[PDB]
DNA sequence: TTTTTTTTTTTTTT
């Protein structure tokens, strides 16, 4: 009765984006924000894509700037 | 406010050619933290000598005034170094620091207006002028700049501009098949739409070195390849589909297969896709191999994005949009095959006009170029000169309109020059 | 300690109980909210409420009105209304005191909007340009029927002035129209590949180069690079095919060198973002006019503009709305707006394929909203062989300045150029 | 709960009053009413006496009427001579009895309807015997709430009430422009809607002494006044536009300005108002100067009261209601300009019908009177007899339906009689 | 409820 999820793996994806961030390309080809289980990750991965559409590009700074926006 | 501040200062200790963009964008006062103010000042102060700007010279400059202890230690300057994602985009942290600066400047002048509202109750009109003036205190491309890019572009013109179709007369009129164009090829059923598109795909994939993606929504990948084999090798299609091949046919086939292998043509025969799906697949193929053309066997077969199964004219109106936008985004010609309404048949002159394009007029409107196929022998059983087929170029906003003639040897699934 | 002439407030209310023809100037100058004291607000409201019957306004009827709502006890007694009567001896210069009450009203309105700007500074740290715009706009807003005597004067003084008119450089059209007038919405509609953009670009050039005015072009279909290349060809008579190949004759480069020269000091601002809302267009123009002054706005292709949120509404309404917004933009910036439009295929069905107003694609409100509707028709667009090729009709199907009619021009397509005859 | 049989015994008094004042006012009064139409027992008897005396004919004044009432047992029953005296002082003039008589009559019809409806329901429970004939009586009994020229009536033998528009033929058919009416003037774009409205406004504001409020949501006040100047003085609009005026044009303008000054026409060109706003403004102008007409430059341009952006047909359905109700409240004709849907341009005959009114059918249904403008020369470039314009009066519950012809000299922004 | 754009079966327009 606990929904299939894999938070560890969710974090690993978001992590890699802050590390690379050319890693956002494969990530978004494979996932949309809603695929993430944790409400918070949903919002973060959305912001990441939102910033990419400018494109800024995507690092730990620009992402928090977009999340505070 | 902060952290973007650190990212800027950080990048300077990392680069330090990053100080140039930084200072073009910011003055020391733009920083919120008292300490950063002083540091960024010192950075510019040392640059004016110019030293230039590194973790040493900066702390030397900060100690030269009473300030090195005030800003945290050398240990705070050390942290700044370690606190930036990528040296390369200072521009984007600087612009955060700058935007925050503007915000509090706004807040500060707005509060001082309100402040003055209670005090100087003396002369209303000049107070309202001050408010106007105190609150004031390009997104268009400038033509000077475009002219240069348009010049330099005409310059890159030693040595078709143009992905070449291999049909001389059409290429003369069109010069490719240009990046970002939507090319509509429409004609009545069984006239030769697919045949024509496939022939273009081959000559592009084999004669040039570019990759071409074909989305077939009606025929299978198998049937497509079999049409290209016949056309590549001049093997009679009936023979080929029976296996009833002459001894020299087997030669022709062996050759045909050879050249089509190094051809690099990517075929997707999923019978129902949305444009989004098409886009996704192409985006990825261009990612890892580079794309040159997209061919779609057939626009009104594509299926809508959710808007509920809307006024069908709108549904395709939208698909039309999406395709042009896809061609624009991938900087690649997109050939979309189209059907025609029966209207054309009711006529005397069975040559199609733009109005005839089936299901939505927006297709005429969106296209960069509209090609009709007309075959006299399609209507006349006896027709004099059979294999001739008009390529009516009814629309193009590159240039010229007009008709071109080719031969469509049907037995070979092949279009040929004259 | 908010700004309030609670002395002058009484003087106004007083004068009304004394006159009471004094309520007329008073109300022309003030609304109830202008009064600082909660009580006066209510009283002056009641005064107007009674006037709308009209009773008219005296110490009796007013207290009758105030008691008719829960309010007579809230404002002091009848004894307070009695004091108001006695506060000022005579009721002559109410105009004076009313204008004090009004001026104080404006002051706190200013203070209130300034504080709420500062307030919003900390909160909506999200979108900087649209925020700074609000401050600009909110501070101007701190500035019923127009009397005809007054308008007549402005109009006479205006006629005292003597193309009126931003001139297109097409003589016969300019005679018929005289510009291209400030605040007009000009619709240019015609079938695909007939010459819409070509025509609009030609007008933009002749305005930007012949006059000294700036012109903004929003291209939602073509790139800036393609637009400029059209203008180059038209400015210098360089064959477009040659130009896009780089296959230029020795004299062509000469032609290009001058074309580039004149188009530099031309001052034409091009925005080729493929999806904008009208609001966005407005914002950009507002700003360009701010710092450089604007003369014309050209929009390649109205139905390509996208809607403001109302959900993906009955599409006819969505464009109905875009239409209104554009006219209202032209009105606000005091500048002619030329919107290109498509046409439905209905015309194709017809015998003669000259368009009528009904043909404008997607919503009938466009005919309605337009100050002026221009159709382009080419005989050679339908006849392959057509006698006199380069001729093109500019059918002026609608204008509420004046005359309706057809004008003829030549459209040398090889040069992306419209010319006079 | 408390159900009060509908009546207006203010309006009743106003009718009887006007008769003692005029008394040629008894003619319209009796064409419209029989004694039984009056609710108050007393008025019934008085108005009966009035007619009784007219049949002699005496004629009808305060004396003869009391003589007739005393001649039957009735003079004491109806209040005294002192009540008959009050009736006289009811109205300032015997102006527009026609108006108040029609209120009394309309109320009479309402309760006749209510009464026959309740008696149908009544009979529903009782005569459960013969279903089909019960349905016939219901049919027939509901028609009889409404009350074909005979050959003899047609042998009268071979061989303005009313704000006056100044167009003779229209005024004959209409007689004003009546207090409390909603008048819809609709026509295709650029046909002459505003022109016609403005022309009416001038002739009212200059020829009569009444004030007129014009709400222009599309054109500026400036453009409106310039249209009127041209029409008042016969100055060519193009000339006036340009300032390119002949020496006599200046004379014509000097004049036109003169007369338009003392004209008293109040113009509100705020591009977005709600009906509530319109009401508010007019209520106030009537307060201090008196109002005669309201013109609105266009109904579907007005904007909705909050109900959320509702089924747009309902949104205008509502605006429509509000306007009629405003006309009713201010006791003043309201001319609302309307657009028409494109469906007319399909027909081989381009004369509008009521259905064509754009956006909501309730407009037909709320209007007291619907006028269409039709121009042959709008459609025919060459049209024989150009300046002619039909004023199709498609609806009016005063009386006659029909078409009227005027000339619309466009160069002068002017409508003229023929 | 309405306004708009499309395809394709009927009748009747001198
Ligand atoms: N005679 C002959 N004709 C063929 C053969 N194979 C294909 N074709 C012709 O080529 C045409 C193919 O048309 P196609 O391009 O697929 O139709 P479209 O996609 O609707 O335009 C058909 O009308 C056939 O007449 C064959 O084996 N023999
Ligand atoms: N003959 C010729 N025509 C051209 C050339 N370049 C552009 N055109 C024509 O100019 C026209 C462009 O019209 P346009 O205004 O862009 O289309 P619209 O915006 O939908 O009306 C088309 O009819 C083209 O065929 C050229 O080199 N030669
Ligand atoms: N010849 C000529 N006609 C004009 C002039 N000014 C206006 N008109 C015409 O008179 C009409 C007035 O506009 P109008 O019908 O009131 O707009 P509406 O609200 O859509 O009906 C338009 O049809 C204009 O063509 C002018 O100066 N000269
Ligand atoms: F018959 Al087809 F495209 F294959 F119309
Ligand atoms: F050619 Al178009 F809108 F039809 F630019
Ligand atoms: F042209 Al309009 F109302 F101004 F129909
Ligand atoms: Ca096919
Ligand atoms: Ca265009
Ligand atoms: Ca017109
Ligand atoms: Ca109008
Ligand atoms: Ca209703
Ligand atoms: Ca209808
Ligand atoms: Ca009525």
Domains in chain B: ranges and CATH: 1-116 (1.10.860.10), 150-418 (3.40.50.300)
Compute, in angstroms, the gap from residue D251 CA to the centroid of ligand 3: 24
Task: Retrieve residue B163's tokens.
Answer: 């992905």
For residue C156, give the H/E element and its range: helix C148-159
Nearest protein residue to nucleotide E1, judged by CA and C1' positions: D313
3-state secondary structure of A34: helix
Give buried/exposed letters for C243-281 (b at 16+ CB in 10 A, else e): bbeeebeeebeebbeebbeebeebbbbbbbebebebebb
Instruction: Look up residue C204 and give its two tokens.
Output: 């933009």
For B213, the token pair is 């993606």
D258 Cβ partners below 8 Å, 6+ apart? none
C52 with D283: Cβ contact below 8 A? yes
* B51 CA to centre of own chain: 45
B308 touches strand E (CB under 7 A): no
Which residues form ligand 4's pocket by a CB distance below 6 Å? Answer: B 189-190, 193-194, 218, 298
Candidates D51, D124, D62; CA nearest to D87 is D62
User: Is beta strand B334-338 parallel, antiparallel or unpaired with respect to B293-297?
Assistant: parallel
Atom of ligand 1 nearest to the CA of B196: 15
Contacts 24+ apart (CB under 8 A), B225-229: B225/B260, B225/B267, B227/B194, B227/B195, B227/B198, B227/B413, B228/B198, B228/B201, B228/B202, B228/B256, B228/B260, B228/B413, B229/B253, B229/B256, B229/B257, B229/B260
The closest of C250, C253, C237 to C418, measured between CA atoms, is C237
Listing DSSP states for C207-238 in one string gives IIIISS--EEEEESSS-HHHHHHHHHHHHHT-
CB contact under 8 A, D284 and C144: yes
Inter-chain contact D222–C331, Cβ cutoff 8 Å?
A: no
Structure-block tokens of residue C382 = 């339908």
**Resolution, in Å, please?**
3.2
Asked if A60 has any chain B CB less than 8 Å from its own CB, the reply is: yes
- For residue C390, give the ligand nearest its CA: 2
Rg of chain B, C-alpha, whole Å: 33
Is the preceding peptide bond at B21 cis, omega within 30 degrees of 0? no
Contact C176, C401 (CB under 8 A): no
- Cα separation, B22 vs B43, in Å, equals 11
How would you class C78 by CB atoms within 10 Å of its CB: exposed for 0-12, middle for 13-18, buried for 19 or more?
Answer: middle
Q: Which helix (H) or strand (E) holds B212?
A: strand B212-216
**Length reported for chain D:** 418
Report how far residue C73's alpha carbon sits from residue C81's, in angstroms, rounded to the nearest whole number: 11
Name the nucleotide with the smallest C1'–CA separation from C320: E3
* Whole-angstrom distance, CA of residue B371 vs CA of residue B356: 12
Q: How many CA atoms lie within 13 A of D90 on its CB side?
A: 24
Catalytic residues of C: 221
CA distance C366 to C358: 10
State both tokens at D278. 């319109």
Report the interhelical angle of C128-140 vs B124-136 (nearest 10°). Answer: 170
Instruction: Check C164 against D241: CB less than 8 A apart.
Output: yes
Q: Enumerate residues 6+ apart whose C-beta is below 8 A from C126.
A: A69
Q: What phi and psi values does residue B118 have, to the nearest 5 degrees?
A: -75, -30
The finding on whether B237 has its CB within 6 A of some atom of ligand 1 is yes
Catalytic residues of B: 218
Residue C205 assigned ligand-binding role: no
What distance lies between CA C421 and its chain's CA centroid? 34
* Separation of CA C310 and ligand 1 centre (Å): 49
Q: Which residues have CB under 8 Å from D337's CB, separation 6+?
A: D184, D185, D186, D193, D194, D197, D295, D296, D297, D298, D299
Specify the DSSP class assigned to residue B274.
B
Is residue C314's beta carbon less than 7 angstroms from any atom in nucleic acid strand E?
Answer: yes
Q: With b meaning 16 or more CB within 10 Å and e meaning fewer, what string describes B183-217?
A: bbbbbbeebbbbbbbbbbbbbbbbeeeebbbbbbb
Q: Residue A30 burial (CB < 10 Å; 0-12/13-18/19+)?
A: exposed
**Distance, CA of D380 to chain centre:** 33
Ligand 6 pocket check: which of C368, C372, C373, C401 to mutate, most ligand atoms within 8 Å of Cβ? Answer: C368
Which chain C residue has the Cα nearest residue B403? C384
- Taking the C-alpha atoms of residue B203 and residue B207, their distance in angstroms, rounded to an integer, is 5
**Residue C338: strand, helix, or coil:** strand
Q: Which residue is it, tokens 């180059």?
A: C232
Q: Is the peptide bond before B361 cis (omega within 30 degrees of 0)?
A: no
What the block records as the tokens of B68 is 């090195």
CA D375 – CA D154 distance, rounded (Å): 34
| DSSP secondary structure letter of residue D359 | S
Query: Would you please indicate which residues of D are annotated as catalytic (active-site) residues?
Result: 218
| Consecutive H or E run containing B268 | strand B265-268
Distance CA D330, CA D322 (A): 12
| CA–CA dist B177, B181 (Å, integer) | 7
Does ligand 3 have an atom closer than 6 angstroms to the CB of D185? no
Report d(CA C320, CA C322) in Å as an integer. 6
Q: How far is C125 from chain A (nearest CA, A)?
A: 6
Q: Do B89 and A59 touch (CB under 8 A)?
A: yes
| Dist. CA B373 → ligand 10 center (Å) | 48
Residue B268 has a CB neighbour count (10 Å cut-off) of 17
A1: helix, coil or strand? Answer: coil
* Residue indicated by tokens 């002048």: B109
Integer Cα distance of D16 and D60 in angstroms: 11
Determine the Cα–Cα distance for residues B358 and B352; give it in Å rounded to an integer: 11
Question: Could you give the CA distance from residue C51 to residue C202 in angstroms, rounded to a whole number?
Answer: 60
Q: Return the closest-CA partner of residue C419 out of C234, C197, C186, C163.
A: C234
Handedness of CA A64, A66, B2, B6 (dihedral sign): positive
* Integer Cα distance of B45 and B52 in angstroms: 10
Scanning every strand, the nucleotide with its C1' closest to B316's CA turns out to be E6
Burial of D82 (0-12, 13-18, 19+ CB in 10 A): exposed
Query: Are the beta carbons of C345 and B353 separated by less than 8 Å?
Result: no
C1' of nucleotide E8: residue with nearest CA: B342
Close Cβ partners of D244 (under 8 Å, ≥ 6 residues apart)? C162, D238
Q: Best of C144, C328, C373 to disrupt the D interface by mutation (most D CBs within 10 Å)? A: C144
Counting Cβ atoms within 10 Å, is residue B310 exposed (0-12), middle (13-18) or buried (19+)? middle
Which residues are CB-contacts of C73 (< 8 A; sequence separation ≥ 6)?
Answer: none
Q: How many CB pairs (< 8 A) connect A and B?
A: 25
Burial of C114 (0-12, 13-18, 19+ CB in 10 A): buried
> Has B169 been labeled as part of a binding site?
no
Q: Is the CB of C354 under 7 A from strand E?
A: no
Picking from D240, D245, D190, D259, the residue whose alpha carbon sits closest to that of residue D412 is D240
Q: At what angle do helices C38-51 and C59-68 cross, to 10 degrees?
A: 110
Nearest residue to D35 (alpha-carbon basis) of D23, D43, D27: D43
CB B192 within 8 A of CB B337: no
Using N-to-C axis directions, what is the helix angle for B34-47 and B74-81, rounded to 10°? 80
In angstroms, the CA of C182 and the C1' of E2 are apart by 34
Residue A53 to residue C273: CA distance in whole angstroms: 14
Number of Cβ pairs closer than 8 Å across C and D? 94
Is the distance from the beta carbon of residue D238 to the nearest atom of ligand 3 less than 6 Å? yes
Q: Which chains touch A (3 or more CB pairs under 8 A)?
A: B, C
CA angle at residue B397 from B395 to B399, to 5 degrees? 90
Task: Check chain C for breaks (C–N over 2.5 Å) and list the residue before each, or none.
Answer: 143, 162
Positive or negative CA dihedral for B167, B173, B177, B179? positive
Report d(CA D188, CA D364) in Å as an integer: 16
List chain A residues with CB under 8 Å of C125. Answer: 68-69
d(CA B316, CA B324): 12
User: DSSP letters of B25-44?
Assistant: H--GGG-SSHHHHHHHHHHH
Q: Which residues in chain C touch residue A69, judged by CB atoms under 8 angstroms apart? A: 125-127
Q: At D303, is the secondary structure helix, strand, or coil?
A: strand
Contacts of B93 in chain A (CB under 8 A): 61
Q: Mind spelling out the 3-state secondary structure of B350-379?
A: CCCCHHHECCCCHHHHHCCEEEEEECHHHH
Q: Which residues pair with B392 in a beta bridge?
A: B372, B403
Phi, psi of A32 (to 5 degrees): -105, 160
Tell which residues of chain D come right before a gap with C–N over 2.5 A: 147, 159
Which residue's CA is the nearest one to ligand 6's atom 5?
D189
State the smallest CA–CA distance between residue D351 and chain C in angstroms. 15
- Cα C188 to Cα C165: distance, rounded to the nearest angstrom: 18
Distance between CA atoms of residues D31 and D398, nearest Å: 13
Rounded to 5 degrees, what are φ and ψ at D128? Answer: -65, 25
Tell whether omega for the bond before B177 is within 30 degrees of 0, i.e. cis.
Answer: yes
Whether omega before D91 lies within 30 degrees of 0, making that bond cis, reads no
Tell me the three-class secondary structure of C104-139, residue by residue: HHHHHHHHHHHHHHHHHHHHCCCCHHHHHHHHHHHH
> What part of C 109-138 touches A (C-beta under 8 Å)?
125-127
Residues in chain C: 421
Q: How far apart are CA D59 and CA D27, in angstroms?
A: 12
Tell me the DSSP string of D21-69. Answer: H-STTHHHHHHH--GGG-SSHHHHHHHHHHHHHHTTT---SHHHHHHHH
Using CB atoms within 10 Å of the CB of residue B249, give its burial: 0 to 12 exposed, 13 to 18 middle, 19+ buried.
Answer: middle
D182-186 and D334-338 as β-strands: parallel, antiparallel, unpaired? parallel
- SS3 label, residue B51: coil
Element (H, E) at B10: helix B4-14
Q: Which of C258, C271, C267 is nearest to C227 (CA)?
A: C271
CB C146 within 8 A of CB D267: yes
Closest CA to A14 of A52, A53, A60: A60
Which DSSP symbol is given to B191? S
Contact B197, B184 (CB under 8 A): no
Q: Which of D273, D253, D272, D269 is nearest to D261 (CA)?
A: D253
Tokens linked to B35? 């300490």
Q: How far apart are CA B85 and CA A60, in angstroms?
A: 7
């Amino acid at each position: 009765r606990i929904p299939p999820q894999s938070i560890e793996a969710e974090q690993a994806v978001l992590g890699a984006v802050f590390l690379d961030p050319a890693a956002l390309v494969p990530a978004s080809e494979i996932l949309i924000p809603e695929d993430f289980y944790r409400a918070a990750h949903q919002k973060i991965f959305h912001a990441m894509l939102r910033v990419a559409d400018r494109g800024e590009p995507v690092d730990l700074v620009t992402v928090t700037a977009e999340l505070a926006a | 406010s902060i952290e973007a501040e650190q990212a800027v200062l950080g990048a300077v200790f990392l680069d330090p050619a990053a100080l140039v963009p930084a200072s073009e964008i910011l003055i020391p006062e733009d920083f919120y933290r008292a300490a950063h103010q002083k540091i960024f000042h010192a950075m510019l102060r040392v640059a004016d000598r110019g030293e230039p700007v590194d973790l040493v010279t900066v702390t030397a400059e900060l100690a030269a005034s009473e300030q090195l202890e005030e800003i945290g230690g050398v240990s705070y300057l050390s942290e700044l170094a370690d606190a930036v994602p990528t040296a390369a985009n200072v521009e984007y942290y600087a612009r955060i620091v700058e935007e925050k600066s503007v915000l509090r400047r706004l807040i500060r002048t707005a509060t001082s207006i309100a402040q003055d509202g209670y005090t100087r109750e003396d002369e209303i009109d000049v107070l309202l002028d001050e408010a106007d003036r105190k609150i004031m205190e390009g997104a268009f491309k400038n033509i000077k700049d475009i002219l240069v890019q348009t010049y330099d572009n005409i310059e890159m013109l030693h040595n078709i501009t143009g992905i070449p179709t291999g049909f001389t007369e059409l290429d003369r009129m069109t010069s490719g098949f240009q990046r970002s164009d939507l090319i509509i090829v429409a004609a009545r059923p069984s006239v030769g739409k697919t045949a024509f598109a496939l022939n273009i795909a081959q000559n592009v994939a084999t004669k040039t070195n570019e990759n071409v993606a074909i989305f077939s929504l009606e025929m299978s990948a198998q049937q497509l390849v079999m049409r290209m084999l016949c056309a590549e090798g001049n093997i009679n299609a009936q023979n080929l589909r029976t296996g009833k091949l002459t001894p020299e046919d087997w030669g022709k086939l062996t050759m045909a297969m050879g050249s089509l292998s190094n051809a690099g043509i990517y075929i997707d025969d999923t019978p129902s896709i949305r444009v989004s799906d098409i886009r996704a697949k192409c985006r990825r193929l261009k990612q890892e191999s580079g794309l040159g053309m997209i061919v779609i066997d057939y626009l009104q077969l594509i299926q809508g994005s959710g808007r509920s199964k809307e006024n069908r004219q709108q549904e395709v109106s939208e698909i039309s949009r999406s395709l042009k936008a896809l061609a624009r985004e991938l900087e690649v010609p997109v050939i979309a095959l189209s059907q025609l309404s029966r209207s054309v048949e009711q006529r005397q002159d069975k040559r199609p006009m733009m109005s005839d394009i089936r299901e939505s007029g927006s297709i005429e409107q969106d296209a960069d170029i509209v090609a009709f196929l007309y075959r006299d022998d399609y209507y006349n059983k006896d027709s004099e000169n059979k294999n001739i087929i008009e390529i009516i170029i009814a629309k193009q906003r590159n240039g010229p309109v007009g008709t071109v003639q080719l031969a469509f040897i049907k037995e070979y699934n092949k279009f040929v020059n004259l």
